[PDB]
């Protein structure tokens, strides 16, 4: 929704499913997955951020 | 009584085992001069064996056909001494431990260096938490009825849930 | 002729190269230097054009990566059949795959997240898996 | 053997075996029709499990039969 | 000097021209074996190979077989050699019928068939000759 | 002066700041733990200096000071051993009556009933019987008192402190520069002429002046109380002249060249001392003196600062023939620019040397009363055999590491390494063929014998009373060694060892050493040994040669030394790294050494060790059942494992019960290792995911996320537990089988 | 041959293309991503199945996926 806002993940395949992550950047220039989110826990690959579509995030 | 077990107080096989242990220790000590350090050690072993067998006889344990004590663990109060009483102690001690641990996890977890505080323990805070475990059952029940014990369904899961 | 100076090794190609596809790699070396063979120990690359033969495309691409990341040399890779046909393989349009090249067309692209694939039961008894 | 050591080692060994066969006089005449490769990972696990099970069952059957029939107990 | 150079002057082939691999001794010795000799009908190649391998095979069965200590050891060894030769000719026939399927060089259906017939005849000849020799020695 | 001392003063600051930052050494681990894998990595890369700094000087300074630390640890271990001998041992009682008194230098506190482990060894003493042969070593040194052991321990402690201080000083205060390390000629001169030359010379002096007279008095029956102190043998020459009437002449014969006058205490009689059952002390004195001379001479071979000497670079460059292109050109740079190459060579040599020590010490017992201590002989042999195998495999592993990391094709053009890499396929194919041939023939001999014995066809087996496979070459060599004294070694009174032939040396009615006859069983077992060694060499050599590339992975070197795989492509690419080759080679080395130890144990129990009667009759431990029972697998299963395992299984209720407990525990750990060896990481990762959900449901969730062990770590743990279980099982088996005596 | 598929979650960082040892993958122009590029697998006959591309993927779950299938000489990593 906005920079720095916490969002609950809804991507079923995501390692951070049902977890809270902070939005880093949002691309207003179209794009299918514009909302970059960062989570505290690192996934199995060691990364802690991913791009999601606004439909795949619960706002708060 | 219980399952055809005769109390170890009147168990001939129990006394035979005691005699065998004592006599074998005596045969072992017969090859040392009286008063030699080995002789004193063996005599102390004999005394400890006699005390162990006497304590078992006086305790009220139930012997089998083999002469060894058997434990009744069906909840019988007369035999709680065998399993119920120690078990409670365990569930207390471990409970304490567990509770304390959980608290530490939930105390240092609200920090940026939460990971760094697990390899390196905050000994002052750690002892602060550890000293509070003697009331772990009450605190656990209070958290349970207060909703602060369990996390909501909104937590990590897998594709098929 | 143009081959890098190499003393020979028992790791070269085998009968399938004669009977099946063989591979060739060409490049240009500004100077003469020693590089590690994908099969043998070491070889000296000639000044100017160097042509080398191998039995697997992976060997050619490993050697190409060595050249690119050590001696900053551009290279080309071809496949030769027993019939004499020669096919150009690695630079498909003169520009490496890492760099975008207008004109390329996507292949094997799915327009949905990986988690939206159909269930195996839906595609059953047809000669297809969920991805296809 | 199949449960501990996995494929890569065996494939690299079969490479040298293929080379040796192809470079032998009086044996180059005879050539395989199917290219010889190491067992697949799943196949190797299955074969190791099969050997484990067969050996287990045979040894225990031998023990249980022989002891009982030898001491009549 | 340098006695190890790439085979066929091709550095990129998986071989080397070592003294064992490419020397007058080995080239002449292998080039005169029936399997590689020039101007031999495949039947003759098979016959030579069979004669070599039949006489060669009676001895192990004769001397190390279960009947080695009996007065009929030699005949049992000969029969075992004959059976093994029959097995090997079966192997050769199936290999020929599987490999070369779609008189000449030995790598053909008819060439290999003639080679196998020659091999059988020569192997039985070698076994019989070994028996004849060992019968009185 | 090309060879010179170069150091950096105050190279590193001494502070505890780093001690509170675990993982500081490596750049990746310094960021702190995100998952538990980090933890494991911190213990795996701790001593991987080469991967922590790109400078060779820094790696060299770390290695030097780590070696100082290891020396400190070894000195502390020696101090502990000597102190437990002085305060907690029956060394004096054993001295008085070595045959009957069982050595023991460990005592257990009575806390849970474990005092049963305090055996009735003797000498009015109770403790755990030791099998380290320390009592025999101390007797050979003429200790004869516990004050000397106490002071030996104190000196060892002071030396450990000095080693620790030297390590600290040579890292943090005066760190030698790289040019200082790269002095192979000077280092070899100093290690040969002084470390090994003057070490031998000093020990020979000790033996001549201390051990010889004291041991001669002890053999004469003098009680240790009446033996004068060792220093008394240095002040009054006559006191030694009574024992060896050649000191009377003094040192004048030595300088005059009349060394023959010293034949009283510098002998070449060989054989074994009939009284103590060990080697003659005079023989060992002459041995060490000759070795000191040779080492001092050899330490002047290399050129350091004065023109005279050998330049190993030129030496290597000079040796090149037609078959090997450039010859040994570039090996000096390899061995002076990479610690992994040097470590590979040194570990291989140390392992082979340890195995040679194990073989030589049993055949010619060097210490008094060690031959008849069957428990000590077996323990020492097996210990040093295991150490040798481990060191050999480690040398292989570090050769592979060098090949992956420190190998540079530019500096290795058409030299020996290049050519070996270029006919690696032929090498491995032929080693594979010879391994298969050896395995087939040798093990099929056993299978054939077993099949024939099961079918009742005993006349068709490979046995002495059947088809015979006599080790004719070994028997011929034994005969030549038997005939050597007087003909090919005219000045040697007796054969080197009684194994080859001769009388039966028995001490106190126990057969210290006797000739060992080789039969068909010896032939078969020796070929089994050769088969296993060839297979282990196959695995390790294949790991070394194919460490950089292969027809599967042309770019294996970029993947590193140890990596799990390269994916399921190309069929499957599991265990393709050289580290995995070491992982398999460790299993095969363990198997081969297990066979070696079983061969030694059964052969010695059935053919050498035993008892003698006053007439001279011999009665061995197992009655010589090796010849007709070591030729079938069932024979090994029944007459060796099942039969000799009675002691362990029946040790409960005695001082050896600890051995039975360790037997079971080793079995348990060995079986436990299979969990890691067979299973894969994905299952455990998913199980941990479920367990983590369970923890999270109660708001218990470690910040350091749990992770299943990496694939490489899974294999390493499985192998470590497998080796521990096997080694412990055989350890308990041998010690309980050879301590019930 | 193995089947290599690229999903629209890709962020066009090129890492999969770089990691590929057999030059199966490449970059093609695209508009659904910020970088304007997407990975493609035009020539999967040369894919060996090492799954290096998947290992070198930043996206939460493997915008590039490899499914092993029929094995040929090329995909079986055989020099013979
Ligand atoms: C304080 C930490 C803590 C707490 C509260 C729990 C609590 C629990 N664990 Mg977990 N667990 C822990 C640590 C902890 N565990 C650790 C360190 C390990 C790794 C060895 C595991 C591995 C583990 C497994 C594999 C399983 C559980 C299970 C369980 C549940 C049943 C009890 C049990 O089986 O214990 C088992 C405990 C162990 C096997 C090891 C415990 C080791 C020590 C005693 C705990 C750590 C104490 C630590 C020093 C805290 C110090 C605090 C101080 C700094 C102030 C329960 C939710 C089970 C479950 O899911 O039930 C539904 C289950 O299957 N646990
Ligand atoms: C299960 C079926 C089976 C049967 C019936 C036999 C039968 C026999 N085996 Mg055994 N064997 C078998 C399986 C079998 N084998 C297997 C599976 C193995 C591998 C583990 C072996 C390994 C084996 C060894 C290692 C040896 C035998 C030997 C023998 C012979 C015992 C010696 C004797 O008295 O004959 C005396 C033998 C002769 C007089 C020679 C006659 C040989 C045959 C019968 C002539 C006809 C063959 C025929 C043309 C072949 C047709 C080919 C094709 C159509 C199938 C006997 C014929 C021994 C032997 O042959 O001694 C040399 C021997 O040393 N066998
Ligand atoms: C180096 C080899 C070695 C070995 C294997 C042993 C082993 C043993 N010794 Mg011997 N000893 C040694 C060297 C050795 N010692 C040396 C060099 C000396 C001379 C000082 C002695 C002097 C000695 C005596 C005088 C006695 C023993 C005894 C013992 C036994 C009991 C030890 C024990 O648990 O007590 C209890 C020990 C402890 C509880 C250890 C303390 C725990 C510390 C505080 C843990 C700290 C770890 C720390 C957190 C790690 C991080 C570092 C930190 C400092 C920063 C045991 C068999 C005793 C024995 O056999 O009784 C019959 C006995 O009386 N030893
Ligand atoms: C490093 C070893 C070492 C050490 C420290 C000593 C030290 C000593 N030796 Mg010994 N010795 C040694 C090795 C050693 N020796 C060896 C290898 C041999 C065999 C040849 C001898 C044979 C020997 C004899 C035969 C005698 C000594 C004697 C002596 C003492 C007088 C020294 C003297 O006058 O020489 C002068 C010093 C130099 C030339 C320098 C002295 C304590 C003498 C003794 O016991 O009198 C007290 C004596 O008679 N030594
Ligand atoms: C010449 C004096 C001498 C004497 C009396 C001994 C005595 C002994 N040695 Mg030693 N040894 C010596 C010299 C000597 N050694 C030298 C010079 C070497 C170097 C190769 C060795 C290497 C050696 C080994 C590796 C072992 C022994 C062992 C033994 C013991 C075995 C029993 C026996 O009868 O030995 C008889 C000894 C022999 C028959 C060996 C004689 C070796 C000759 C002298 C080699 C000479 C090489 C020559 C000088 C080369 C010069 C080249 C140079 C100019 C370039 C015994 C105490 C064994 C032992 O103690 O195990 C417990 C053992 O394993 N010795
Ligand atoms: C001179 C001896 C020597 C030296 C200096 C080294 C040094 C090194 N080795 Mg080499 N190695 C050696 C001997 C040696 N090794 C031997 C004998 C073997 C054969 C097994 C190996 C096999 C080997 C492999 C396969 C590898 C190394 C690696 C390494 C490096 C990292 C080591 C490390 O981090 O330790 C970490 C140490 C530990 C984690 C401690 C574990 C110790 C074992 C597993 C447990 C011991 C159990 C104990 C004895 C008994 C337990 C009793 C039980 C009841 C509790 C380092 C350069 C690694 C590397 O990458 O280097 C580049 C690597 O991959 N080495
Ligand atoms: C007891 C079980 C066992 C057996 C029999 C083998 C057998 C073998 N291993 Mg394996 N291995 C095992 C356990 C075993 N291993 C385990 C537990 C591990 C884990 C560490 C390994 C790891 C391992 C590696 C890493 C390597 C081997 C290698 C070898 C080979 C050595 C060469 C050889 O002897 O060929 C001869 C074959 C035998 C002796 C097997 C017995 C055959 C008998 C004698 C005859 C059988 C009857 C006959 C075939 C009848 C035919 C007819 C019948 C079909 C009806 C051989 C295939 C090496 C290899 O393949 O290269 C040479 C190698 O590199 N193994
Ligand atoms: C010690 C080893 C003894 C056997 C060595 C065999 C001759 C070895 C020998 O004479 O090598 C000598 C040969 C000659 O090399 P150059 O003299 O040109 O090399 C000069 C050297 O100083 C190195 O630069 O080297 C090779 O060809 C190596 C590859 C050998 C190919 C043959 C290998 C056969 C191995 C199996 C033989 C086993 C026999 C039983 C072993 C107990
Ligand atoms: C010298 C030597 C060697 C080798 C050797 C060999 C290898 C040998 C072989 C041998 C052989 C391999 C022989 C063979 C022979 C054969 C024969 C001799 C044959 C004959 C035949 C015949 C006579 C036939 C006849 C017939 C027929 C054809 C058919 C039927 C009818 C008849 C009967 C007429 C070497 C150098 C390594 C080393 C040293 C020694
Ligand atoms: C066991 C030990 C110990 C101790 C030890 C000791 C005590 C040792 C000693 C040692 C010694 C005590 C040594 C010495 C040495 C010496 C020497 C080595 C010498 C040499 C000399 C020379 C070489 C000479 C030469 C010459 C002369 C004669 C003069 C003239 C000229 C000339 C120069 C030629 C302790 C307890 C600490 C601990 C543990 C270890
Ligand atoms: C059991 C198992 C696990 C799970 C094992 C784990 C996570 C190890 C757990 C270690 C515990 C937490 C430490 C305590 C262990 C003992 C109580 C004592 C310490 C032992 C040493 C670490 C010193 C794997 O991750 C694995 C991965 C790949 C192949 C096989 C396997 C495998 O077999
Ligand atoms: S099974 Fe494990 S080791 Fe084998 S290819 Fe797959 S990930 Fe790699
Ligand atoms: S590695 Fe993944 S995110 Fe990067 S370009 Fe390839 S498919 Fe896209």
């Amino acid at each position: 929704m906005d920079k720095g806002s916490k969002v609950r993940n809804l991507r079923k395949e995501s390692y951070w499913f049902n977890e809270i992550g902070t939005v880093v950047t949002i691309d207003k220039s179209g794009i299918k997955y514009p909302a970059l989110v960062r989570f505290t826990k690192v996934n199995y690959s060691g990364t802690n951020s991913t791009n999601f579509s606004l439909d795949e995030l619960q706002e708060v | 009584d219980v399952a055809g077990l005769i109390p170890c107080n009147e168990s001939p096989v129990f006394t035979k085992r005691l005699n065998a242990s004592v006599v074998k220790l005596e045969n072992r000590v017969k090859k040392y001069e009286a008063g030699s350090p080995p002789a004193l050690a063996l005599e102390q072993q004999i005394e400890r064996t006699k005390q162990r067998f006497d304590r078992y006889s006086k305790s009220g344990l139930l012997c089998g056909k083999d002469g060894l004590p058997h434990l009744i663990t069906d909840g019988r109060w007369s035999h709680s001494i065998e399993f119920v009483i120690p078990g409670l102690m365990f569930l207390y001690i471990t409970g304490w431990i567990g509770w304390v641990g959980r608290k530490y996890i939930r105390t240092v977890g609200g920090d940026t260096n939460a990971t760094e505080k697990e390899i390196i323990i905050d000994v002052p805070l750690a002892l602060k938490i550890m000293s509070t475990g003697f009331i772990w059952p009450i605190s656990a029940w209070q958290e349970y009825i207060s909703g602060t014990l369990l996390a909501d369904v909104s937590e990590i899961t897998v594709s098929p849930r | 002729p143009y081959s890098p100076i190499f003393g020979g090794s028992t790791g070269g190609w085998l009968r399938a190269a004669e009977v099946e596809e063989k591979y060739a790699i060409t490049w240009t070396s500004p100077k003469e230097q020693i590089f590690e063979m994908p099969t043998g120990g070491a070889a000296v690359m000639l000044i100017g054009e160097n042509l080398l033969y191998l039995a697997r495309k992976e060997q050619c691409l490993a050697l190409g990566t060595q050249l690119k990341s050590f001696k900053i040399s551009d290279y080309k890779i071809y496949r030769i059949f027993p019939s004499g046909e020669v096919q150009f393989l690695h630079p498909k349009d003169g520009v490496f795959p890492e760099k975008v090249n207008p004109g390329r067309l996507p292949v094997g692209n799915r327009s949905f997240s990986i988690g939206k694939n159909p269930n195996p039961v839906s595609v059953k008894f047809s000669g297809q898996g969920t991805y296809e | 053997m199949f449960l501990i050591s996995w494929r890569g080692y065996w494939q690299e060994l079969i490479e040298t075996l293929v080379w040796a066969h192809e470079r032998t006089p009086l044996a180059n005449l005879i050539s395989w029709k199917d290219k010889p490769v190491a067992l697949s990972i799943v196949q190797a696990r299955l074969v190791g499990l099969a050997h484990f099970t067969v050996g287990y069952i045979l040894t225990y059957a031998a023990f249980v039969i022989a002891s009982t029939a030898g001491k009549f107990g | 000097a340098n006695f190890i150079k790439p085979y066929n002057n091709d550095p990129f082939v998986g071989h080397l021209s070592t003294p064992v691999t490419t020397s007058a001794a080995t080239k002449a010795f292998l080039g005169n074996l029936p399997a590689y000799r020039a101007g031999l009908s495949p039947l003759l190649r098979g016959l030579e190979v069979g004669m070599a391998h039949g006489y060669l095979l009676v001895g192990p069965f004769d001397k190390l077989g279960p009947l080695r200590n009996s007065e009929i050891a030699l005949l049992s060894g000969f029969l075992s050699a004959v059976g093994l030769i029959t097995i090997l000719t079966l192997c050769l026939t199936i290999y020929g019928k599987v490999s070369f399927q779609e008189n000449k060089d030995l790598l053909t259906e008819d060439g290999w068939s003639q080679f196998t017939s020659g091999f059988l005849v020569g192997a039985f000849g070698g076994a019989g000759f070994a028996y004849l020799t060992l019968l009185n020695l | 002066t090309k060879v010179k001392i170069l150091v950096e003063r105050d190279a590193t600051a001494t502070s505890f700041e780093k001690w509170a930052k675990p993982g500081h050494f490596s750049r990746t681990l310094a960021k702190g733990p995100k998952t538990t894998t980090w933890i494991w990595n911190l213990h795996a890369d701790a001593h991987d200096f080469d991967s922590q700094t790109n400078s060779l000087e820094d790696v060299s300074r770390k290695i030097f000071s780590a070696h100082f630390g290891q020396l400190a640890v070894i000195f502390l271990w020696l101090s502990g051993m000597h102190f437990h001998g002085a305060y907690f041992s029956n060394y004096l009682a054993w001295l008085n009556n070595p045959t009957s008194i069982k050595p023991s230098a460990q005592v257990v506190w009575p806390i849970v009933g474990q005092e049963i482990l305090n055996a009735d060894v003797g000498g009015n003493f109770q403790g755990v019987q030791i099998t380290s042969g320390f009592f025999q070593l101390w007797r050979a040194e003429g200790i004869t008192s516990e004050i000397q052991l106490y002071w030996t321990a104190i000196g060892a402690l002071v030396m450990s402190g000095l080693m620790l201080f030297a390590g600290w000083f040579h890292y943090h205060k005066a760190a030698p520069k790289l040019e200082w390390f790269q002095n192979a000629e000077s280092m070899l001169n100093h290690h040969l002429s002084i470390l090994l030359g003057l070490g031998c010379l000093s020990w020979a002096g000790h033996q001549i002046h201390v051990a010889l007279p004291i041991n001669k008095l002890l053999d004469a029956g003098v009680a240790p109380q009446e033996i004068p102190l060792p220093h008394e043998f240095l002040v009054n020459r006559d006191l030694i002249a009574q024992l060896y009437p050649s000191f009377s002449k003094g040192l004048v014969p030595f300088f005059s060249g009349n060394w023959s006058e010293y034949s009283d205490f510098l002998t070449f009689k060989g054989g074994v001392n009939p009284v103590t059952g060990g080697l003659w002390l005079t023989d060992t004195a002459h041995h060490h003196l000759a070795l000191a001379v040779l080492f001092i001479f050899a330490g002047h071979m290399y050129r350091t600062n004065w023109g005279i000497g050998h330049s190993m670079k030129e030496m290597l460059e000079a040796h090149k023939g037609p078959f090997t292109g450039e010859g040994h050109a570039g090996l000096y740079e390899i061995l002076t620019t990479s610690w992994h190459a040097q470590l590979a060579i040194n570990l291989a040599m140390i392992g082979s040397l340890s195995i040679i020590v194990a073989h030589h010490m049993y055949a010619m017992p060097p210490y008094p009363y060690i031959a008849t201590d069957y428990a000590t002989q077996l323990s020492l042999f097996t210990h040093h055999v295991w150490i040798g195998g481990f060191c050999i495999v480690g040398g292989a592993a570090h050769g592979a590491i060098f090949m992956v990391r420190d190998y540079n094709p530019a500096k290795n053009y058409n030299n020996l390494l290049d050519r070996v890499i270029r006919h690696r396929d032929s090498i491995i194919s032929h080693l594979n063929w010879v391994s298969i041939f050896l395995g087939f023939h040798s093990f099929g001999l056993y299978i054939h014998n077993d099949t024939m014995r099961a079918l009742g066809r005993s006349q068709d087996m490979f046995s002495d009373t059947a088809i015979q496979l006599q080790p004719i070459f070994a028997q011929w060599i034994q005969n030549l060694h038997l005939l050597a004294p007087g003909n090919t070694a005219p000045n040697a009174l007796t054969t080197a060892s009684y194994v080859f032939g001769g009388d039966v040396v028995s001490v106190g009615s126990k057969i210290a050493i006797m000739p060992i006859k080789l039969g068909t069983a010896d032939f078969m077992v020796h070929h089994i040994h050769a088969f296993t060694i060839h297979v282990t060499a196959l695995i390790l050599l294949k790991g070394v040669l194919y460490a950089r590339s292969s027809k599967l992975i042309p770019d294996k070197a970029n993947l590193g030394f140890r990596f799990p795989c390269d994916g399921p492509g190309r069929g499957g690419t599991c265990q393709v790294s050289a580290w995995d080759h070491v992982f398999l080679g460790l299993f095969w080395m363990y198997n081969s050494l297990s066979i070696v130890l079983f061969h030694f144990s059964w052969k010695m129990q059935s053919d050498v060790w035993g008892s003698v009667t006053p007439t001279g009759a011999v009665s061995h431990i197992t009655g010589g059942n090796f010849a007709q029972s070591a030729i079938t697998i069932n024979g090994w299963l029944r007459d060796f494992l099942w039969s000799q395992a009675s002691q362990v299984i029946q040790s409960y209720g005695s001082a050896l019960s600890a051995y039975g407990l360790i037997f079971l525990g080793a079995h348990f750990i060995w079986a436990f290792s299979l969990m890691f060896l067979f299973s894969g990481r994905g299952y455990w990762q998913e199980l941990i995911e479920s367990i983590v959900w369970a923890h999270n449901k109660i708001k218990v969730a470690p910040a350091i996320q749990p992770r299943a062990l990496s694939i490489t770590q899974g294999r390493a743990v499985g192998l470590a537990h497998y080796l521990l279980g096997g080694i412990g099982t055989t350890w308990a088996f041998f010690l309980a089988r050879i301590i019930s005596v | 041959s193995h089947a290599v598929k690229i999903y629209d979650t890709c962020i066009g960082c090129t890492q999969c293309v770089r990691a590929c040892p057999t030059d199966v993958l490449e970059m093609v122009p695209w508009d659904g991503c910020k970088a304007g590029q997407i990975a493609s697998a035009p020539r999967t006959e040369d894919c060996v199945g090492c799954k290096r591309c998947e290992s070198a993927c930043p996206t939460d779950f493997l915008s590039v996926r490899v499914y092993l299938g029929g094995e040929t000489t090329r995909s079986m990593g055989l020099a013979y």
Side-chain angles (χ1 to χ4, degrees), chain F residues 208 212 237 240-254 258-266:
Chain F
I208 295 165
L212 258 65
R237 188 186 298 183
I240 314 93
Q242 300 169 8
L243 296 170
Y244 302 102
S246 60
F247 282 72
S248 306
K249 291 87 186 180
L251 286 168
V252 74
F254 173 84
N258 298 335
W259 296 357
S260 176
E261 299 184 11
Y262 289 146
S263 62
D264 301 3
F265 64 93
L266 295 177

Side-chain angles (χ1 to χ4, degrees), chain F residues 212-516:
Chain F
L212 258 65
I214 291 173
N215 283 273
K216 189 172 182 65
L217 291 171
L218 283 168
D219 293 5
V222 181
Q225 287 67 37
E226 276 60 14
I227 301 176
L229 298 173
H231 75 81
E232 283 286 327
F233 291 104
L234 289 172
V235 300
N236 52 6
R237 188 186 298 183
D238 57 325
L239 179 60
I240 314 93
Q242 300 169 8
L243 296 170
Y244 302 102
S246 60
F247 282 72
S248 306
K249 291 87 186 180
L251 286 168
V252 74
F254 173 84
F255 302 102
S256 68
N258 298 335
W259 296 357
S260 176
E261 299 184 11
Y262 289 146
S263 62
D264 301 3
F265 64 93
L266 295 177
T267 54
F268 212 135
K269 50 177 62 171
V272 168
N273 185 337
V275 174
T276 62
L279 289 170
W280 292 96
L281 259 291
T282 61
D283 286 59
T284 58
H286 189 185
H287 163 91
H288 285 107
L289 188 56
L291 276 177
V293 173
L294 270 183
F295 283 132
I296 296 168
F297 258 78
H300 299 72
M301 181 178 177
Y302 308 107
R303 181 198 313 164
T304 64
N305 263 10
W306 308 258
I308 61 171
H310 280 275
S311 179
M312 285 180 284
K313 185 171 179 294
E314 284 64 19
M315 223 201 297
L316 291 168
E317 289 180 357
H319 291 67
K320 69 184 75 197
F323 292 92
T324 61
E326 303 303 338
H328 301 81
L331 298 183
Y332 187 83
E333 285 67 25
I334 281 174
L335 294 174
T336 58
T337 58
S338 61
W339 290 85
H340 291 293
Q342 208 73 58
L343 177 54
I345 297 176
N346 300 18
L347 275 171
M349 294 300 95
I350 278 290
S352 301
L353 193 56
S354 171
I355 301 169
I356 295 166
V357 168
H359 267 274
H360 286 187
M361 287 187 70
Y362 91 84
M364 297 169 296
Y367 305 104
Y369 303 108
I370 198 167
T372 52
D373 201 353
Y374 299 152
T376 291
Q377 289 285 72
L378 183 62
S379 300
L380 295 174
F381 182 91
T382 63
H383 169 97
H384 287 111
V385 163
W386 279 121
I387 298 299
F390 271 100
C391 294
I392 289 169
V393 182
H398 283 284
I401 295 168
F402 152 83
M403 197 68 66
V404 175
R405 292 185 177 180
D406 301 328
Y407 177 82
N408 193 18
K411 308 180 183 301
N412 290 286
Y413 182 69
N414 204 329
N415 73 336
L416 275 54
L417 261 173
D418 183 7
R419 298 205 134 194
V420 171
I421 300 296
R422 286 203 279 102
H423 82 295
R424 64 187 180 183
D425 286 75
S426 181
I427 299 171
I428 298 299
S429 55
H430 287 71
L431 191 41
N432 185 2
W433 165 80
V434 73
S435 295
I436 297 171
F437 163 84
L438 279 161
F440 265 133
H441 278 260
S442 57
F443 186 59
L445 300 205
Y446 282 92
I447 301 299
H448 171 100
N449 286 344
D450 183 86
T451 304
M452 296 297 103
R453 192 166 272 175
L455 295 164
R457 299 161 61 179
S458 302
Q459 70 284 348
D460 292 330
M461 324 206 313
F462 293 111
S463 68
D464 305 78
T465 59
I467 302 169
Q468 296 196 38
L469 308 168
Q470 296 294 326
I472 54 170
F473 305 134
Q475 299 172 350
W476 168 55
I477 292 168
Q478 282 194 342
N479 180 252
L480 285 173
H481 295 167
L482 210 182
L483 305 179
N487 317 334
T488 62
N491 304 125
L493 281 63
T494 315
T495 179
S497 185
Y498 286 110
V499 173
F500 306 130
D503 300 62
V504 174
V505 174
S506 60
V507 187
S509 66
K510 282 187 175 299
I511 299 163
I513 182 67
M514 58 149 50
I516 300 177

Side-chain angles (χ1 to χ4, degrees), chain E residues 61 64-67 75-77 79-84 86-87 90, chain F residues 457:
Chain E
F61 297 106
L64 293 171
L67 305 183
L75 181 53
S76 68
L79 288 168
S80 307
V82 168
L84 187 49
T86 309
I87 281 294
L90 251 297
Chain F
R457 299 161 61 179

Side-chain angles (χ1 to χ4, degrees), chain B residues 92 95-97 99-100 129-139:
Chain B
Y92 192 64
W96 183 321
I97 300 170
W99 188 249
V100 161
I129 306 309
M130 285 168 63
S131 70
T132 83
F134 67 107
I135 52 168
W136 76 262
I138 306 156
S139 303

